[PDB]
């Protein structure tokens, strides 16, 4: 989270100033007036949580699940995009599919040895598997995943023949998606939708023909079973193609939706008769949510030209060729707000009465249940390890957590900088705006966090708003990966305050490829310290979306998602999951700290282990990377930076004296707060450990030294803040979010506020 | 062995005053008054000797005794602890009969080749063995074990089917365990008591169905066999879990025990109706002989939170499923004294007359005889090496040892320090103690010197009682893994004198998580120049255990045990042992000596071996490391230490002549004693053959540099003394105990002392 200022959001965030969005700069901040209106309605869903193990499993394989799971990889992988991944596979696919001479191999592993298929006998020797590590041995995949599913079409036509003893299951979990974002994405998703029907039809047709041949009983086959198997197989393959280009045919259809959004000349590009409203293509006339794609479109490219245009087509089927309607992805689909419904709001603010607070935020989760684990193995190859939780650790580590989630009520947190806003009168206002005041998305970091990229440097990046081109593929893109999602965020809950649209396509002097986003007229009280664009004229009109939210009342949100953890244990006691690694090692932390008793030292320590009294020291646990709870405690962390240094800054200079102890007064319980909710965290489960242990190597060391003379340190409150807080601290520490230096800060923030108390206790 | 200040023993052996197992130091010695009283009685029994083979064996598998081996090894392995080697045998558990597609290859090892199982037709090619082989190339365990008890489960539900071809035989020895200690331990202990049921579930159930479908006569069977077997076997690994977590059901049942036992408020912990008393938990009311698994309990951790506790539960399962009741381990059960019946006790001591001297000891072994063997290995593999006793050498080496068994008759023994005593007149009594006396554990030096840690090193660690934290995990802990059983020693013997009970928790200032050790009010004589608890009136109340001791009667000990070697040699005529390695290679030595006849040296060595008499060098013979006698020879030199210390101390002033030639004339029969004992030590058997084979190279050493002209020195005293108790303690030497500066020592002492005789020889 950070902010910026209202009326020189463009100088500020600029690149976040969605004018950015479009190539626009110039003398004139895009805008303008202009036509046609319609609310762009209907959003694609919610893609965030919903967080599941699913099943691949059998051999009757559903493509549609697979295909979910690709784009899931995707962005999880080691590999962007979807898109490369299924020319891979279209390449895996011949090498295996269109290669024939491995299905003679195959059977050969199968039944074979002599005079396949051994009449009518049944014998299926086969664990499913054990087929996967005969193909293994063929040509690998960088990104296996399908390399099962051959199997499964392996098993496929082989199910109706006596081999379905092998019969085993196959487990994988989710991943996250965004908004969600980038129509490169949707490129993913289109190319993928072939993938439905690129893979299906060789996951269809196939045979129910041949039993084995029948042939009473059915029967012999030679190469007769790789045979019918392959050459169909390949005959499949032939029929797969989706023949209609990836980029081209979203860059279309997103050209005919964006022409028709145009007020200004659709020219030769027009509504029409069978051009349009072919009773699907008119509901994403209704489905106009999937604008923006029209903005990086022109963006990310130019011109978009139809090409394969035609006019018959298309209409006629391309639109109805379009994704989402083929439902890959987290495409997601629904109606308006309910992807805005975790939206937080707050006005705040005052007198004026709009502007210098108003902030926004999302309701979230606390199912303090994490997990770590073993990860078995029963035959090397690459990761298929099975895992069981770890439950005597797993339960109180989570049950650690339990105060927590009644700490930091994140709404309840909102309040805290909220609570700021009085700090400092008195009022401006129009010397200085208005605030950014709002953002500080929980979603943005996690998004980015997940992947471990540290959001935190994606931010100053929109704030300068131009990427700083760190030149690599898992790198740069990554950081735009979110800045998408990140305008992707205020269009939405713009929406709603208000339906008010258009705007017009803003040509400037350079250069007509297009170039039109959309305008809110909302409604207004009667005042603008707020916003460059003064037209307070019973509204603002206006050209851009925050201002929308600047004007807007604090409603106070409905919201209420919050995730949950997996089932994860309860079915990898039977198979295998693969996002694995990535959840990683993973045991931090030896915690030291010094009590400066008198002239001397004492520094202590403690081997993260025994805190759970667990012996000895465990070497192959591996804890998740539980998300979330980090953005939550860093905007709680950076949200406090923000408080110090304004507080600090107030007394510094305000001025008259009236206002600075009331800050500075401010300053002490706002620490007093943390001071107290610091003890929730650890001494109540399970850090009363840690001071145990620590109190037991401090006054070990009393003796150790000789004198356990001066040791009266068991007792009150400097050094009792000092052991506490470093407990809660620690324990926290342990947890697998904020770092370390966050720690120090933070023992820097109490130590001149005041620490006093005597709170304990 | 060593000594302290009965006053000052908290100055003193500060982490031995029991104060110190709890966190106890301030400026108070713990204790006070309070109040709930009841003997704690029936303590778990005596593992000390008791050492046997146990016989893996039969793939009809018995879980129990494995159970026991676990535990044994993992005290005796290379991982602690068993914990650990359960959650690792989980994971091997999953890696194996949770991974189907080894079966298969299992089967194919078996009858595998085609359309199995070959009809009706036997034909069992396999030794257990070979399959053992087999599963060798598949996942390594560090510790096999279970890698033989696996494949004890193919056999026992391939016994049904004809594959009993195989049977041989598989064998394992014990491993002495203390008295028993820690309570990590007893998790230890819960967590295999979980194996019980972990693994006999896959042990049991099984089939007797299917022979071998039946089908007559039974019958066909491809991967059939392995499907049904490995399958079932997943599935017995599904009911096998035992849920409940190792480290917190001993927590919550201690904790009600513990609390049960509070004269301090119990509070909203009480006894209560079905909370408590349900037919077996007030046993454990009986079984309170556990008690210190409370006190480490809140030392090792803290609050002892019953966290599941639930108030049906636990009561209703949880104690019920409290292992001893489970029966694995050393875990051991017995009533009272029987494991105080090897409590040695010798008030000694006069006029006073309580304090300067009051020893301990424990009678034990000398069973004489010990063996070696060559390793012999049909096949490479791990360690499965069949060795045969050399008795040749075995039988005469352990004749070798028949004096020495009369020899240091450690009752006896004991006897010396005791008529130490009365050095050195005159009486003090008040102005300085008061003494140890009393331990010169031959338990706490074996129990540490059959690992080779050498114990003596862990002594001076309870002197200053802090541990001084040589990290690592088979150093560290290892030490405080005796010091444990330290503790545990003095309280057993405190129990019978006096069942007089209870303390109080003892909270001091800080901090209330529990603190309650136990309290003797025995019955006493009215004079205390011992112990700082003047508290004389009528009897000592008293805060620590060893006053009681102290106060105590010599009453000399009952006390009859001494082990046994094991008959080894009769069953690995047929079988394999595995503590081997451990019982390591092993033969020195080269003990040269001089013999400084006028201005030359003439120094003679020899060659081990041929002083059996046996030609020519052996290789690979393989004495074990007997243990026991270690200690009694230590304590014997490290007494001797005490004695000619105080006894030189004593000649330094004392003062007063009548004294000094006591002493100094009770120093030389001392060492004449000693003389004469060394004489049995050797020239009997099998020494003689050293002074023969010394006499040899010496003489023709004379020859060799020329004249054998001075060569008288076949004869008296000086030289005769010189030779033989060189002799004595060569074969000493050739004894696997007493390393070689107490040789030098030895001598050292000798030559002071006076040497004169003549009393040869």
Redesign the interface.
Known sequence: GFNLKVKDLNGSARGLTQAFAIGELKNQLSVGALQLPLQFTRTFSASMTSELLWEVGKGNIDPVMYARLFFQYAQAGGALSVDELVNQFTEYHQSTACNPEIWRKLTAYITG?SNRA?KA???????P??IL?QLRTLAPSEHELFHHITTDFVCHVLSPLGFI?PD?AYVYRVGRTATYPNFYALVDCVRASDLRRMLTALSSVDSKMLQATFKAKGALAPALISQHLANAATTAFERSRGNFDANAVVSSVLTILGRLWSPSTPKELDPSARLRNTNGIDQLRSNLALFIAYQDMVKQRGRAEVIFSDEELSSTIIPWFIEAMSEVSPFKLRPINETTSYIGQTSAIDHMGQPSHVVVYEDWQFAKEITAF?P????NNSNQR?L?VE??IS??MS?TLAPIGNTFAVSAFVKNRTAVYEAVSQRGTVNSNGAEMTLGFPSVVERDYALDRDPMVAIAALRTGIVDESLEARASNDLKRSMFNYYAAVMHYAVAHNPEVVVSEHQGVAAEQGSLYLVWNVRTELRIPVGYNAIEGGSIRTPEPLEAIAYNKPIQPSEVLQAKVLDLANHT??IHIWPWHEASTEFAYEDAYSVTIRNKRYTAEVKEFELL??????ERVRILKPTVAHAIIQMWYSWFVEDDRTLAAARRTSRDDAEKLAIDGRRMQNAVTLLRKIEMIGTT?IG??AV?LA??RI??Q???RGL?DD?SD??VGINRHRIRIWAGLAVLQMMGLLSRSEAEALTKVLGDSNALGMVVA
Not at 376 to 379: D, E
């Open positions: 040895s051994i006998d049944a014998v299926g020797k086969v664990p598997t054990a590590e003893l085993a073993t078995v193995k029963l035959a099975f069981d439950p005597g339960d109180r049950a006691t039977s009294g667990l012996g000895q020291r465990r489960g009363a450990s145990h109190q037991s006054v070990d009393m003796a150790g356990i040791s068991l007792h």
